[PDB]
């Protein structure tokens, strides 16, 4: 009802968007092909709600494409595939608070380091003359 009329007894309070995380950073992923996006989860009501919504977890994004998603509302770090960033050539990722209502804005784009983006390699060598 676009400014029409109402009456039917109904109480529906506004929910979300859920408060987005902060202090986003990339430490290191269990594997050389992944990373660890660490962040600080905002206090959740004594009932299980961030900004009025039911936070079920978080979600990592690079260039608008969900690369990773942790089903943990109290998660302070999640693993993300680096390859997913290559195809898109994304030099940074973000964390969004996922809830039953939807998702939240993109946290501080944590520019992934080039050292982690690049794969490992053994010490090279050549013709030893002197």
UniProtKB/Swiss-Prot annotation:
Pro residues bias: start-end ranges: 116-124
Membrane-spanning segments: none
Ranges where the Fibronectin type-III domain occurs: 20-121
Record localization: Cell membrane; Synapse
Annotated domain remarks: The SH3 domains mediate binding to a proline-rich motif in RIMS1, RIMS2, CACNA1D and CACNA1B.
Family: Belongs to the RIMBP family.
Biological role stated in the UniProt entry: Plays a role in the synaptic transmission as bifunctional linker that interacts simultaneously with RIMS1, RIMS2, CACNA1D and CACNA1B.
Quaternary structure, from the entry: Interacts with RIMS1, RIMS2, CACNA1D and CACNA1B, and potentially with other Ca(2+) channel alpha-1 isoforms.
Protein name per UniProt: RIMS-binding protein 2
Native organism: Homo sapiens
Originating gene: RIMBP2
Full-length numbering of the shown residues: 477 to 593 of 1052
């Amino acid at each position: 009802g676009s400014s029409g009329s109402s009456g039917v007894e109904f109480s529906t309070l506004p929910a979300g968007p859920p408060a987005p995380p902060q202090d986003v950073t990339v430490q290191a992923g269990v594997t050389p092909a992944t990373i660890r996006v660490s962040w600080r989860p905002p206090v959740l009501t004594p009932t299980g709600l961030s900004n009025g919504a039911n936070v079920t977890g978080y979600g990592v994004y690079a260039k608008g494409q969900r690369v990773a998603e942790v089903i943990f509302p109290t998660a302070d770090s999640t693993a993300v595939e680096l390859v997913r960033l290559r195809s898109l050539e994304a030099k940074g990722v973000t964390v969004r608070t996922l809830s039953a209502q939807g998702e939240s804005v993109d946290s501080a784009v944590a520019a992934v380091p080039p050292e982690l983006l690049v794969p490992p390699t053994p010490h090279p060598s050549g013709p030893s003359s002197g």
